[model samples]
Target chain A: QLQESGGGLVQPGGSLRLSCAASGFTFNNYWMYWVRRAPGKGLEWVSMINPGGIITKYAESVKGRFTISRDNAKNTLYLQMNSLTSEDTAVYYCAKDWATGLAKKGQGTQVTVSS
Target chain B: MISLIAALAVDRVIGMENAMPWNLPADLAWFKRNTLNKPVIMGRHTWESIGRPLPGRKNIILSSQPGTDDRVTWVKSVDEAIAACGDVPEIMVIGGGRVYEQFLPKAQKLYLTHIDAEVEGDTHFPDYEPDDWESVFSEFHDADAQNSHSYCFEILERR
Candidate 1:
């Protein structure tokens, strides 16, 4: 099983950090994915990570401003972004991507970036 | 209502099989809100691509192969799936490719997410004529914190 947590307001041009708590699955065996959704709309794939601190993929659109990483001892995956805008307002999700690269959305985290 | 959720490319390709190429969170939330508790229909390959029955909705599989599951109802064609829906108000036509092509003509509603990107793939939403449908609503979102590519949510109705 996988679970995500993190939510709050952020200021424009500021930075934000969020994390997800994972369990019931062996770390390093699967990829961790970060995705987000607007308040009343669609989803966006953010980034993905392997357990050993390697970023397997970037969303192409969010490069340079976003970072995804995982901590073995914490059993959590983390997302950090800087220079945010109101457009950054969304609910972030950390999902477990199996060997097939399919993101199984578990619990998700909400983040509001505004002025 | 028969609805579809697609993230298409500039050339109208929807990318590879199994793994969804892009992530559009708002589209997912919208899918959950509108389709939950309703009947979600799709072909067998589409069902395999999703790996399991979608939670909170009745899974109707349009296929010739035998399938086993209490949550999943296996039928032979789109009409059978529709018949099973009976009076559910809306039937979500999830796709792998052929299913969308087969049902597009009979679809009255479409939730199309036009993702702006050039992609290479074998599967696609069947070519459509805009004149046959009316755009009830549309909203565009530029690539932001959550999305990798820009996209628009268009609710289309057959005329």
Candidate 2:
């Protein structure tokens, strides 16, 4: 199972970090993905990390702005981004693979980048 | 220069979970027919979903970073996406959801495949009134061994 945390209101241009706590499986043995949906918009593939956090891929949309990592001991995956904007307002979710293994999903965490 | 193309469920649904809700080879063929050799614009998610730059066409991806090669260009904005097309007589705005929403208003033609079934979906084709478009061509296909659902291929021009 997966549960997301760390989101609320963030000031524009401020740094932001989010987390996905994983359980019920070997955290470091599988891939993890970060995806988000803007208000009334479709899901966007933000970033992903392979097993052992040895490999990572970021969508061109968030290349340099976003960073993804994890702590195997804590069973948590992390997402960090800076220079926030209203355009960043969205509900973000962490999943187990790209699509097929995407059967597992975190109850999305809503992030509001304003004020 | 802008055209839109999509395969949507009866409820205007375009995707479920993170992928297409249905598998219809006929729709894929229809998609290739309309978009082959043309410059196709798409969101990063849509670009990733397709897995790679479709061959024989200039793939212009809307993103905040650089792209892959001569055939693929990652553009940062709508204007940049248009500029990347570089005189393509007709640009096809293929999509996921947000890209469609951003380009629908500027599109003069729409090539849509209407799937017969309605299923759960996280993304949808933006809503538009039928009165706003004129159907120039339409063909219906029945469910077969390859395609799970019956579907229709429709080409509509803005009225």
Candidate 3:
């Protein structure tokens, strides 16, 4: 399937880069999306990608700083950004499985950033 | 003023045959959390679909049907929904799909709960150009004993 696998302590005045590795019959078809979650707080769709080609869309807010790209050789996708802030912190699942359902409890697979 | 209801995939089918199959308590709790003190404007069908006035919020229903309920104010249009608001700064538009489609253009923000399942439909949320709105928040809730559907609360603002 799709696995979101990155983000590791965006340092003081540092940038952020997250990785999403896809497997299974993931096929790189359709769209691979990224939505940040703040749990019991809020969730935001920051951006998305089409692993098969050069198609990327973003929410206007994140559009100013976020970038998305794919490397089919590894069957993976990446969401990149710089000039980060606390408001920029949250658990953002890498790729979405629209065919299945939500990546819920404990399925959220990372602890990328730190205190 | 927008919505907070479980929707069928890509579209919001909040009710069917003028009745509701889903209004999970958390979703209702979610609605009360946001619209508690604000006025709630709903189409007559939506009003009838929900069955009765929601507690702690002013209920305003719009329709040409004949009725009088001192228990709630009945209006004829969205314009009246707006004009009826006194010094209040906000009005929450709770809807039955058609009203949602009707109000989407005028809605400033959308409060949506994207249910993980598809639903049979008599009504569905209308689709809109993606570029016209910007998502600001999304909160995923794992299905618990209290609710059957694992869903997410999403907030999108007009761009």
Candidate 4:
């Protein structure tokens, strides 16, 4: 099973962070990814990381402010974005990356950033 | 408003090896009419398995990777799909397997085609109690006439 945290507020120039705790698998061998959803919209895949801390960022269009990290010892994943804005208001999720390149079961959380 | 459509089995399998072996043209037509001009949401594998976007409909493919071809509008997660759909009168959730499981709870309606016969598969749809959804409409079609293995078309509304 996977678990997540939701409902946090970040003011302009402030920072926001959300987390996911994963169970039932070894964290070191897998990749963890972050995704966000603005209200009433489609999901946007964020970034992903392998156990070695290697990360692959998506297109330049979505490269700003977002960062993903993981702690194998704790089986936890983290997403942090800085200089928050209203556009950052939305729910977020994290999941184990599959070899097929598709997202599997996700642990969802909500983040609300405001002025 | 957007709804999710899924074809599943008693064990809830949606696909095997990223492809659906069964060919039900009537079901395809029904899916087409119901989703045409509207946006259809799916995972990357589902889009890749289908090989391309359906013509005349907006295809939004959710992926962790960016820079997808023009044929698909790639997003990252199910919530984002819902938000991107915006005020569009409707959106369809077509799937590979995992995508359906993620969005099942949020779906207001389900268009399910239950095939009478079952085949061995690798992936499965999630299982839910019958009380979870109400059967609002249903129609049974003869397999021989439709050239299918035998199937039933059902429309269920989430209760």
DockQ, every prediction: 0.03, 0.03, 0.01, 0.01
Real A-B contacts recovered, model 1: 0.00
User: lDDT values of the candidates?
Assistant: 0.74, 0.80, 0.64, 0.69
Provide the lDDT at B126 for model 3: 71
What is the two-chain DockQ of model 1? 0.03
Worst 10 residues of 3 chain A by lDDT: A103-112
* Model 2 C-alpha lDDT per residue in residues A1-115, reported as the tens digit of each score: 8999998999998888999999999787766788899998977768777667766777656778889999989999999988888888999999874444234679989999988
Best candidate, DockQ: 1
Residue-level error in angstroms, candidate 1, position A1: 38
**Candidate order, lDDT descending:** 2, 1, 4, 3
Model 4 ranges off by over 4 Å: A1-115, B16-18
lDDT string for model 1 (A49-113, tens) is: 65566435666566788888889887888888888888878888887642222447766777788
Estimate how well candidate 4 is docked, as a DockQ score: 0.01
TM-score of each: 0.58, 0.56, 0.53, 0.54
Give one digit per residue, the lDDT tens place, for model 3 in B2-120: 44333444345555322222224576677678889888877776666557788898888877783566778888776876787667877787776766766777777877777765444
Chain B TM-score for all candidates, comma-separated: 0.88, 0.90, 0.86, 0.88
Q: Give the better candidate number (3 or 4) by lDDT.
A: 4
What ranking emerges by TM-score with the best candidate at the front?
Answer: 1, 2, 4, 3
lDDT string, candidate 1, B27-54, tens digits: 6777787789888777876777677788
Docking class of 4: incorrect
B1-159, model 2: which lDDT tens digit per residue? 699998887678886323433446678788888999899998887777777788888988997766675657888999999998997789999886888999999999999988876555658799778899999998988754455457898999998
Model 1 error, position A76 (Å): 20
